[PDB]
Every structure is written in C-alpha cells, then in structure tokens.
Design a protein around this ligand. Structure first.
Ligand code: SF4
Ligand code: SF4
Ligand code: FES
Ligand code: MG
Ligand code: ZN
Lengths: 85, 54, 115, 208, 125, 96, 48, 689
C-alpha cells in the first residue's frame, strides 16, 4: 500500500530489454519529474530477464518480469505499481 | 664434494670472504638447488637387498 | 569418455542389488560384533548406525561410485569379522567423545568465525 | 675432461633405443609412446588395458626376460584428466637391463591386476590402492596395507592434506583411544621457495 | 559392452573429506600475481587452486600460531583453468575463478628520451 | 641489567613480562622464570669505539673464519660512528 | 683443563649447574614476544 | 605491417620498433635485466641484457635495440652467457656481503640472476667499495653500499612522481645515487622505489628485519584507503599482517600503490575494538558478551520504529554490511539511512549510476585529449588517478586544466581562477577554454566529490553538467566517449550509492533519530549535540576513534584484511577483498553481526551465508556482483535534463580542496589516524629533517 522505492534492472545489450531501454530513453525524465521524492534505482543485468522491484513499507518487495516488454507496456506496468491496482 | 657452488655449499671461508659464495650459500640453504624435470629409478645393493628410489 | 569402463554391475539395478547384499551382510554381523568386541552398545544401536552409514550415501547416482562404495564396505566388514579392528575403531564409528557441534547461525556466530 | 659433469653412454643409449623400437614394432596395439632419457633409462607409455599382455611379453619373451618386478607405484597429477599414473619398473637379469612401463587411470577406472605375471604385484597393488584409491580388478586380496584400520581417504593424493583430518588420543572417560578432528598446537608453515627466474632454458614450454 | 553415465562426475563420497570441509569451502582458482619485489615472471605460468583462510590463534604455551583447518596449506597446481575447474567440480568444493592478467604490450623507444619537441625528453641519465 | 616489573617478574632482554591480570603467570609458581642476566645491548654499549685513519674499514668480527662475513664500513660522516651491523662494532675516523 | 685452561669470557658462568629438572629451579617455557594487538582504552570521563 | 624476426630460429611477427627483449618476451623468453623496467624509460646501463645476433660480431643491449627484418636472436648462446657472467661478476665484485642482514634476502634479483646466469666463484682479490648511507625520510631506509647504480629510482622519481630530487653525483666508481643534500624524498608514491629497487639498497623501514619472503603467505585482496580500489597483496605470517605489496592491474593500479595504502597496515594493530562493550550505572564503557549487547540493541530496536531510526555509513564499509543494515532498518519501516558524504540529490540524484560514476575509466584517461579538473586535488584524493593523468600528460601532451586552488600537482597545468564563476563562464562560452574544449577531440570533465560537500554542490554539479552538454552539442554526438565524470574519495561511497543510501546526513539533521547506528562512522558529521537527549547509539566498527567514544553500545567488527568484502571504486568497478587474517578477540564480520542482531530482534534476515548475502546484493544491484566488469550505460541526457529544472546560485567562495598538503594526505581516515608510521610521516613533513 505504501510504496517506498522502485528499481528497474535492464540488460544493456540483450534485445529483451529494447522496450525497457526505450522507457528510460524518452519516458524516465517525465516519470521522475512526476515523482521527485521517489527513489527509482536503475541498474543493469548480465543474462537474467529485466526486472521491476517495488519495495513497500516494512521491507515488503515484489518483482515483475519486464522481458520482451515495449515502451507502452513498461509505462503501464509502472503506472500500475504507482497507482496500487 | 662436487666443485659446483650452485649444487653443493662452498666452504665457510669462501662464504665469509666471497660475494658469490655467500649468495650461493644463502640460496642453497634457503631455497636449494633446482633439479631438472625428469624421473629416475636408481637402485643399489644395500645390505638387505636391492634398495631403490624412484 | 562416453563409453566409460564399468567396474561391474553395469547399470544401477545390479548396483542396488549389491548394495542390498552388503546391507544384509552387515545386518547379520552386528550381534557378532557386539558379542566379540564386548561393546556396551545395544544391537539396535549397531543396526541403526549401519543404517545411517548406508543412508549418508543414498544420493549417489553413479554405478561406478556405488560399486566402489560397496567394495569399501565389504573391506570394512571383513576388517570387523576377522577382529582385525579393536573396540577403538568400532567406537570411532560413534564419535562418542565429541562435544555437540552447534548448527544454528546464532550459536555459530557466538562460538567463533566458523561459517 | 669435465670433472663435474656426468659422462654420457652412447652405447647404452643406442641399445635402449633399438630395444624400444623393437617392442613398439612387436606390440603396436598398446604401445603409445617410447622414450629414452639422457641418463639411459627406457620408458614405454602404453594403453591401460594392455598391462597384462605387455608385462607378460616383457617377462616371457626370449629377447626380453624381465623376470624381476623391481617396483610398482603411482604418481598423482591432478591437472590431467586421468590423474593417476601407474609405473612398473622391471629388471632383466639375463640381459642386465631395466625397463619402465607407464599407464594411466582415474578414480573410477579399474586397472587389471598383474599378480599373474609377478607375485610382488600383490602387495605393490595393495599399497597403490591404499595410498591413491586405484582399484585393481582381479586382486586375490585387495585391502588397506599401511593406513590405520578404518582410515578414510587415500593419503598420497595431492589433494589430501599433510596432517590429514583426524588425530588420535587416549580419552580417560571412555577408557580407550579416540579419534578427533585434527588440531595442531603449531601450524605447519608453508614456504614459497620457487625463484621467479627460469632455471633451465632446455625445458622451456611454448607460451600458448 | 561399455556403459554410459550421462551425469556429472562426483567423487566426494570417495575422497573421504569431512562434510564440513566439502560443503563450507570455497577455493580460489587463479594465476598468482607476480611478486612485485622481483622482475621475474616464471612464477606466473601455472594456475593455482587454494582454499579460503580460516582462524589462527595464539598457543597459550610458547605463543605459537595454532590452527584447526586441515586444508590451510593445501595448494594445487593446474596447467589450465579448465583443468582446475574440472578438478574442483568433481571434488565438490565451491570455486571462484579469476582470469589470468597478462601485461599489455608496450611501445618502448630509447630515442624518445631526446625528443626535440615532446615532453618525453629526460632531464637526467 | 635485569629489571623487575611492578608484579615482581623479571623482564627479559626483549621486554617480555606478563601483565598483572594475566593468568599465565601461574606457570612460574613454585618454579622459576628462565631469564638470561647478560644483555647484549648493554655489553655492546660497554665496548668502546675504535679509531682508524682511513675512510673505509673492514670488519669480520675477529678470528678470521670464526667471525662473521667481512664487510666494509665507510667512515665519511663525522657526526656519527660507522657501525658494523653483524657484530655491532663502532669505528670512527680521528677528528680534531 | 689444568694443562690447557680454556679462554675466559665475561659472560661464561662462574658456577656450573647440573640438571635442575624436578626442582623449583627447573626451566619453564614462555613466550618472549610482546602483545601484537593493542586494545582500545575507553575514556574514563562519561559523555553525558 | 609486422616484420618477421627469429628467436633461436623460431619465427616471430613483431611490430617495427619492437626491442630484442620484447621479441624474446613475445616468444616466451625473459631476458635477464636490472635497469630495465617496462613502466619506466629505457636506460641500458647495467648491460645485463646483452644478447647475440646470429651474424653480428657484437652483442646488443636487448632492452634498447630495435629489431630489424630477419634478425636471429641467440638468447642462450655462448657469447650471451659469457656476457651475462661478466656483468654479474662485476656487479658482485663490488657488491657487499650483506645477504643475511639484508631485507631483500630471498627475493633479490641480484641473488636470483646470479644463481641462474652468473658464475659461482669470485676472482676479486681486492678490497670492496663502501658508500655513505643517506636519509630520505621515515619510509625508505637506505643502505647505499648495496646500490648497483641502475638508476631505477631516479627514473621512477622524475617520470612517474614528477619529483626530480634524486640523481647521481660524481662520476666513475665513486658515483653515488641520492639527493646530495639532506632532503627527504617525501611523496605519496615513494614506496614504489622500494618495490623496484632490484637490490636491498632501498628497503621498507617499518618492515625492516621483521620477516623473510619465503615465510610470508600472499593473500590477494584490494585497497580501501581511497576510492581508486587498488589491487594489493597482503603478506602475512602466522596470522599477522606483515606487509602490503602492489598487485598488477593495468586498468586500475598499474603496479603502483600510494604510501597510505602501503604503510598504514600498522594502524590495524592499535586502538582496535576486540570485545562488545556497554555502559554500566556510572556511564563508563565496560566489556560484556555478544548476547547482552545484542539483547540491549534488539530491545531498543523493538521499542522504536519509523524515521526515529538512523544509520550513518563511514568510509570503510562493505556492500554486504551496507545491504544488511539497510534491510534491517527497512524491517522496522525506518529509513534514516545515510552516508557521511554529500552528493546532490536534486534531479536524477542517485537514480542513474552514470551520474556519480567516473564515466570514463581510469585507463580511459590515456585516450583523452583535454582534461578539466574542478574542485579537486587528485594528487592526494586519488594518487593513482593523478599518476595516470601524469602518464597521459607525459606521453600524449595532455592539456590538463585545473579550476580553483593552485595545488602542487606533479605536472604543468593551466590554472583557471579559484571560483565557480569561471565554471559558469566556460559553460556560457565567454572563456577561451570553452573554445579549447569545443575544438578538443576527446574532452573530459572531472568534478571532485570534495567540492560537492559545499553548500552549493548541486549548483556546481549543474554547471559542470552544462559544460559537458555544451561540449557534446558542438562536437559530434556519435561515439562511445564519455565526458562528464565524478572523482570519489571514499571507498564505500559508490557501493552505498548503488545500494540506495541517501548521501549526506541531512536526513538525520532534518529528523533527529531516537536510535542511531554508526557503521564505521568516524567522520564526526553527527554528534550528540545534534542528536536529542537520551538518544541510543550503537557503533559497529573496528577502531575506536569518535563513534566508539560517543556511543552507548560498541560492536567490534572486521577490517578489510580480516573480512571477505565487496568494495566499488570511483569508476564503478566492483571488487572483492579476501580474508588475510581473522578479526581479533571477539570481533566478528559486519554482515554476520547485523544478521545476528536481526535474528535476536525477531526480524530475521533471509540470508545466512556469504553466498546468500551476495545474492541479496545481486537482487538490489547486479553490478555489485559483476566484479571485474566496469562498462555501463550512459544516461547523461536524462541527468542533464533533470539537473536543468531546478537551479540555485553558486557561492562567492573559492574552491579549496580539503587536502592541500602531504600531511593532509597522510592523515585521512581511521586506520591512518591509528597508524604510527603515518604519524611519523606527518611529523617529518611538518617539522622537517
Ligand atoms: S641486495 Fe641482494 S645480493 Fe645484495 S646483500 Fe641484499 S640479498 Fe645480498
Ligand atoms: S638505489 Fe636501487 S633503484 Fe636506485 S639506482 Fe641503486 S639499485 Fe637502482
Ligand atoms: S636491462 Fe638492458 S642494459 Fe640493463
Ligand atoms: Mg628493494
Ligand atoms: Zn663486525
């Protein structure tokens, strides 16, 4: 219910993160400016699928696979996490 | 002993007066001489029979 | 190599057969071992220890490893039957003089640096 | 003359090389390689399943009467796929010579017992098993010879620690000797003695 | 004929090592770094497998350095990283592999010490 | 010159002495502590300084082959003596 | 020794000692090295 | 193209200009050498490397002679062997008999090359030469009778360290290497002369007489004294840290280490925390048991929650400890997690790694065309980075420009003012250095993280980001080259930022905590004056410097030589330090302590082993488990756009580094402050002589 931070793990070279890299490329700035006080930690993966961690209050974390997502799919998934639905 | 200071130690006087002899004494009593790679089986007529080392 | 030389037993079925044969040989020997060595343990304790020693290698899935294990088990049995061993070794199977080693993280942390 | 340098024996070197060619021609099925060391010692590297035929030939052939089994041991080289290297040293009294036969094996592959060729192979192979874990197929009585009763592990392997894993003492509570995990009052001090400068150019290996 | 085992090799049950020193040991496969005090590079030819460091304490008598780790002085030499990895895998220990570090080729020129217009000119010999 | 610790235990030439609260002092009870009463530093201090009229001197510890390897000491710095470190022996050029 | 006395040194013992084992004069081993690690000494003045 | 030479008849393909020694090394033969060092210039005076060419009647110095087409190099020929024997004979003829009393001992090039290439007997029937010893500081002990006049120390001094106070005086057999005056060779890179001196003339003074090379066990770990992450080797003996030596890593360390790394190991033997400590009725710290200390800490942790719980991370903390403490504090919904170093959190902040990382690696400096340093003193903040800049300067005519205080860098640089007004002007384009940057093919902008500690760190970061943006726009956008850079000076900073710690203790200052965990925090940024009354402080660390005096509970921990740990250097590369010795007394590993505390408190953490803790590190940030990899993504566009939205005004204050002199270099952190050798160095550089 109470979000604390969100982390995005995207492999730099693998094609499975093409949509995720597009979201970082031309949608991250709008997102961060919308949530100035939300820690959005962007990290890189080696051979695992791209992942979306969401740490809530009292150390509760959930991860959503972002494999073969597009820019719209990543945006919708991140909006779902922020909204809470 | 074989007159080869890289295998057998030199005399005490040579060690205490010669730089090469001191270096060779140091190396022989700390690291020891290197033996070229290879395997041998040498046997002798020890009093109890053929005593050998491989 | 793809075609590994078999010690014997070929597949795992004959290896299991040899395991069961060795287990029977050990099981029928525990009363004699207790009687001759004048052990203070029960016969049930000896059978339980044989069972435990058999079970610690239950995860082996290689017929050659199983064959080597049963060969060494037969060697150990022939040491016991011929009274080549003493009460010393038979009791060495039991670790009777060791303090109970802690297994929880907190106890390991308290006692020392052992992982 | 060079007083400090061991003289060479070209006659013996040539004789040993000729005999190595002879045995290699006679037994192509097993002989993988033949070598003569520069101090006149003949070595034959054969396939592991040719131990019995090669030893029987070198024992019974008229031109190779190696009646006496001088030695039989193993050498552990972990970096090889087949770590264990079984070595047979044979003495021929009629021709006043010595030969060496080397085979290879690993932990799980048996080596045919050569007690039908030489009787000393009995205890020699028992020792090899006890110290390296190499199993010999048709051994009349294969068991530990040197290690303690119930000893676990094969001490002469390169990966077996020098002090082992257990030590013995007399425990008064149980009125018997007990085996407990090893614990040294003073730890063995490992010395790094190799010099970083190459000693023998003749044995240099390609950098690869 | 000859059987086939389609499984990874494992001799841990035969080596005789205690379960503690089988499960809780992470060896280090690497090529040793050159001793910086010497220019010789002949000790950086072969890969080495060594175990992790365990506790050493002071002997109450004589103040020596005691130990309880059997594999403290156990160092093995392997010709190749693949050979070392295979040995560690078949013996069941954990392992960390470090790639060999070879110096990069460098361009050396004695005449650069007397450059007409470059900073490489040396002020002393 | 042996010295006594505040706990009554003699100090060796290396400065070794157990603390007051150390349990290991119990080993000397009903017995004695093996301490050598001759201190090499004190003895070598007692030894005098030689004066030779040369820039370089050679020390072998005396006795020839019974002494230490021969070394050469440079007597150029007049603010201090040149000490052969095998035997801790001081040499000096005659100043003034 | 009467005909050929040994060389006299200022450190050689004047009185010889026999085997003193089994007596309160016996040798007792100990460490001749000081403490390697110095423990931190907390202040004697309370912070509050 | 490559030309074809021959080594003992074996064909080798080498570049034109390659030396005979390098060709032999390529074929696999290491020619004996004394004066030759690959990192130094070519001297060619010891004459030990003479080899024979097949048809040439004269031997050639293999370290200085370029190879020609169709040259057959006879490495093991009779002429080469005789030449080596003669050179060794001369060297040992004038060398003194000091091997048993010489620290070089069993790791001596003269001894080893004598045993491998020289004769075994002496024909010298004359007296030997004696040389007066010099004094060049408290670090290097000089016994100059053993010198062989190989001029390695002189060449290293000048070329690498930028200090030309070493040289040869006189000529002939009386030539001496030294300073000719009573001057101490004090520099942050003065132990490498100890390393490269082939003989025992230059030796370590703290290490003098203590041990012999064959006894020492070598443990390959990394360095934590600065943010360079130098690769080192800890030499131990019977469970005691005896020595620190460099380990080669050409992209980070390059065989050299700073003096703080090399000689501060003795600070691990003083002021050490060995037992858990609590406070009795009188308020004095007393030793206790782990159970009691952890029970008190767990009781307080259960009593409080929310933002009333804070952690302050110091400069020598590892990724495992940081993540364990972060998880423990998140288990109580607390979030007052901070490090004692400030980074601007306005805009992108810590979200993008290519916003606080040194985007071009340390090895990438050698390719840069122009470099601009803003608010930093790389000579002391990161000595190896400064050495790399010096190397690039020397070998490529790099145009180094420093904005702010004119510190004594070891090379000529363009001094730009002292104020960030110049920084604003360069971005606007008024300054000519804007034109220089625009014309430069490969520019680099390095903003020292010491300048971010100022009240206007965000403004400075925005200004340098705007400078980098102006460079990018005018120049070609295409290319993998990265301009913007941040140079760190704290070992744990990059790892903490990657994990997600909030930089600076501003959160604690904003909301004072009831419970404060000082994890190695000896910086003194937060004290009980800032904290409210009856605040509960738990200091977990290895030295008692500040946090231990001002704490309520003290938890002993492990050092970098005593724990297996993960540290990330200033360029983003992760590394692991291995266990050399074990923590003294009752001290334990940091993540183990945190996990045990969590278990006692009832909020048990999901990891029990080092592998599981590093799996948690992978979950948080996989770059913490990808060790030798340094490459990453570039998000400069996003970082710049986010920095543009909010802007503040630069202070009218000059940019002054915290460390202006070598004494400030010597005294920087807990281990250095506890070290006796560092105190000796400080005294020597302050009072002279
Ligand atoms: S520098 Fe080398 S040769 Fe000279 S005294 Fe020292 S160990 Fe001996
Ligand atoms: S002091 Fe050492 S490094 Fe310097 S010239 Fe002499 S031998 Fe070479
Ligand atoms: S190494 Fe070439 S002359 Fe010195
Ligand atoms: Mg040196
Ligand atoms: Zn002397």
């Amino acid at each position: 219910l109470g979000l604390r931070e969100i982390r995005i793990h995207l492999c730099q070279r693998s094609p499975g993160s093409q949509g995720v890299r597009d979201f970082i490329e031309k949608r991250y700035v709008e997102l961060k400016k919308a949530n100035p006080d939300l820690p959005i930690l962007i990290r890189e993966c080696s051979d695992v699928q791209p992942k979306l961690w969401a740490r809530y209050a009292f150390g509760q974390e959930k991860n959503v696979s972002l494999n073969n997502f597009s820019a719209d799919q990543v945006t919708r998934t991140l909006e779902n996490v922020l909204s809470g639905k | 002993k074989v007159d080869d200071a890289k295998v057998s130690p030199p005399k005490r006087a040579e060690m205490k007066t010669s730089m090469e002899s001191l270096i060779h004494h140091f190396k022989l009593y700390t690291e020891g001489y290197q033996v070229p790679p290879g395997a041998t089986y040498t046997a002798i007529e020890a009093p109890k029979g053929e005593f050998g080392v491989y | 190599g793809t075609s590994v030389k078999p010690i014997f037993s070929r597949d795992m079925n004959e290896a299991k057969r040899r395991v069961r044969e060795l287990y029977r040989a050990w099981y029928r020997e525990v009363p004699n071992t207790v009687h001759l060595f004048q052990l203070d343990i029960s016969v049930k304790q000896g059978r339980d220890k044989v069972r435990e020693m058999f079970m610690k290698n239950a995860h082996v899935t290689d017929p050659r490893v199983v064959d080597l294990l049963v060969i060494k088990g037969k060697m150990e049995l022939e040491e016991t039957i011929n009274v080549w061993k003493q009460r010393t070794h038979i009791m060495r199977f039991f670790h009777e003089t060791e303090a109970p080693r802690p297994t929880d993280f907190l106890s390991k942390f308290y006692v020392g640096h052992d992982p | 003359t060079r007083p400090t340098i061991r003289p060479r024996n070209d006659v013996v070197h040539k004789q040993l090389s000729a005999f190595g060619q002879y045995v290699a021609e006679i037994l192509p099925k097993y002989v993988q390689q033949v070598q003569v060391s520069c101090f006149n010692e003949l070595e034959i590297f054969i396939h592991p399943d040719g131990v019995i035929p090669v030893l029987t030939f070198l024992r019974d052939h008229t031109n190779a009467q190696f009646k006496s089994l001088a030695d039989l041991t193993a050498v552990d080289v972990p970096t090889r796929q087949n770590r264990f290297e079984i070595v047979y040293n044979l003495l021929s009294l009629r021709f006043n010579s010595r030969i060496r036969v080397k085979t290879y094996t690993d932990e799980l592959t048996p080596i045919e017992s050569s007690v039908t060729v030489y009787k000393a192979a009995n205890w020699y192979e028992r020792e090899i098993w006890d110290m390296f874990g190499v199993f010999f197929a048709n051994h009349p009585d294969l068991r530990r010879i040197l290690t303690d009763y119930g000893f676990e592990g094969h001490p002469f392997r390169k990966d077996f620690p020098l002090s082992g894993y257990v030590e013995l003492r007399y425990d008064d509570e149980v009125k018997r000797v007990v085996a407990e995990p090893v614990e040294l009052a003073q730890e063995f001090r490992k010395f790094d003695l190799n010099s970083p400068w190459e000693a023998f150019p003749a044995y240099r290996q390609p950098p690869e | 004929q000859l059987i086939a085992v389609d499984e990874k090799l494992d001799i841990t049950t035969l080596t005789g090592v205690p379960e503690e020193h089988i499960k809780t040991r992470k060896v280090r496969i690497f090529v040793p770094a050159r001793n910086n005090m010497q220019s010789g590079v002949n000790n950086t030819k072969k890969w080495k497998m060594e175990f992790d460091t365990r506790e050493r304490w002071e002997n109450p008598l004589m103040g020596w350095s005691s130990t309880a780790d059997p594999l403290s002085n156990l160092v093995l030499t392997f010709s190749t990283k693949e050979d070392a990895v295979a040995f560690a895998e078949k013996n069941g220990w954990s392992f960390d592999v470090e790639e060999r570090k070879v110096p990069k080729p460098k361009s050396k020129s004695y005449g650069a010490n007397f450059s007409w217009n470059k900073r490489t000119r040396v002020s002393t010999k | 010159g042996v010295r006594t610790s505040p706990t009554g235990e003699k100090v060796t030439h290396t400065g070794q002495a157990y603390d007051d609260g150390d349990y290991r002092r119990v080993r000397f009870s009903d017995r004695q502590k093996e301490v050598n009463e001759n201190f090499a530093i004190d003895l070598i201090a007692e030894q005098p300084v030689s004066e030779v009229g040369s820039r370089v001197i050679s020390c072998d510890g005396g006795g020839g082959a019974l002494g230490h390897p021969r070394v050469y000491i440079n007597l150029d710095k007049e603010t201090k003596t040149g000490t052969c470190g095998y035997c801790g022996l001081q040499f000096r050029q005659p100043h003034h | 020794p009467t005909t050929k006395p040994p060389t006299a040194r200022k450190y050689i013992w004047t009185n010889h000692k026999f085997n003193v084992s089994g007596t309160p004069q016996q040798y007792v081993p100990y460490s001749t090295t000081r403490k390697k690690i110095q423990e931190w000494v907390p202040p004697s003045t309370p912070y509050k | 193209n490559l030309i074809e030479v021959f080594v003992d008849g074996q064909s080798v393909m080498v570049e034109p200009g390659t030396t005979v020694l390098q060709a032999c090394e390529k074929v696999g033969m290491q020619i004996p050498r004394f004066c030759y060092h690959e990192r130094l210039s070519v001297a060619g005076n010891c004459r030990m490397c003479l080899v024979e060419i097949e048809k040439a009647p004269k031997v050639v110095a293999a370290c200085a002679m370029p190879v020609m087409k169709g040259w057959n190099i006879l490495t093991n020929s009779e002429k080469s062997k005789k030449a080596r024997e003669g050179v060794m004979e001369f060297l040992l003829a004038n060398h003194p008999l000091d091997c048993p009393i010489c620290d070089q001992g069993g790791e001596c090039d003269l001894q080893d090359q004598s045993m491998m290439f020289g004769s075994d007997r002496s024909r010298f029937l004359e007296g030997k030469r004696a040389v007066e010893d010099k004094n060049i500081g408290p670090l290097v002990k000089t016994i100059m009778t053993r010198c062989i006049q190989c001029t390695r120390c002189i060449r290293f001094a000048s070329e690498i360290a930028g200090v030309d106070d070493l040289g040869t005086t006189g000529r002939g057999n009386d030539m001496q290497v030294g300073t000719y005056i009573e001057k101490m060779f004090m520099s942050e890179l003065s132990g490498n002369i100890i390393d490269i001196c082939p003989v025992g003339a230059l030796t370590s003074k703290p290490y003098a007489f203590t041990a012999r090379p064959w006894e020492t066990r070598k443990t390959e770990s990394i360095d934590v004294m600065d943010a360079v992450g130098s690769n080192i080797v800890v030499s131990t003996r019977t469970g005691e840290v005896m020595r620190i030596l460099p380990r080669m890593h050409e992209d980070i360390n390059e065989e050299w280490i700073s003096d703080k790394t090399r000689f501060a190991y003795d600070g691990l033997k003083r002021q050490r925390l060995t037992q858990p400590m609590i406070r009795n009725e009188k308020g004095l710290l007393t030793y206790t048991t782990w159970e009691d200390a952890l029970s008190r800490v767990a009781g307080m942790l259960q009593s409080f929650q929310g933002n009333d719980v804070a952690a302050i991370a110091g400069g020598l903390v590892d990724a495992e400890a940081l993540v364990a403490l972060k998880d423990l504090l998140n288990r109580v919904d607390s979030d007052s997690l901070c490090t004692e170093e400030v980074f601007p959190t306005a805009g992108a902040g810590t979200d993008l790694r290519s916003n606080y990382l040194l985007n071009t690696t340390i090895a990438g400096v050698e390719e840069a065309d122009v470099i601009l340093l803003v608010g930093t003193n790389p000579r002391f903040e990161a000595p190896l980075f400064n050495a790399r800049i010096r190397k690039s300067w020397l070998h490529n005519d790099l145009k180094v420009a420093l904005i702010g205080s004119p510190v004594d860098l070891t090379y000529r640089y363009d001094h730009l003012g002292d104020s960030p007004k110049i920084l604003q002007d360069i971005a606007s384009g008024n300054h000519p250095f804007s034109q220089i940057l625009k014309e430069a093919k490969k520019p680099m902008v390095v903003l020292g993280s010491s300048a971010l500690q100022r009240s206007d760190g965000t403004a400075i970061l925005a200004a340098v980001s705007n400078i980098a943006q102006n460079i990018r726009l005018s120049s070609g956008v295409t290319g993998d080259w990265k301009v913007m850079n941040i140079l760190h000076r704290i070992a744990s900073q990059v790892a903490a930022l990657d994990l997600g710690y909030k930089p600076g203790v501003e959160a604690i200052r904003k909301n004072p905590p009831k419970v404060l965990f000082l994890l190695g925090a000896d910086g003194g940024c937060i004290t009980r004056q800032d904290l409210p009354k009856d605040c509960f402080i738990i200091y977990q660390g290895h030295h008692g410097d500040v946090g231990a005096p001002m704490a309520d509970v003290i938890l002993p921990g492990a050092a970098y030589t005593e724990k297996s740990a993960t540290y990330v250097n200033t360029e983003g590369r992760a590394q692991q330090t291995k266990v050399a010795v074990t923590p003294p007394g009752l001290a334990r590993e940091d993540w183990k302590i945190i996990r045990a505390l969590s278990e006692i408190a009832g909020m048990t953490l999901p990891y029990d082993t080092l592998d599981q803790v590093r799996s948690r590190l992978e979950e948080v940030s996989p770059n913490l488990v990808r060790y030798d990899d340094v490459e990453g993504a570039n998000y400069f566009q996003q970082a710049n756009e986010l920095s543009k939205l909010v802007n503040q005004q630069l202070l009218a204050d000059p940019l002054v580094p915290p460390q202006l002199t070598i004494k400030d270099f010597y005294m920087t952190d807990s281990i250095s402050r506890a070290s006796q050798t560092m105190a000796k160095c400080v005294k020597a550089v302050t009072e002279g002589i």
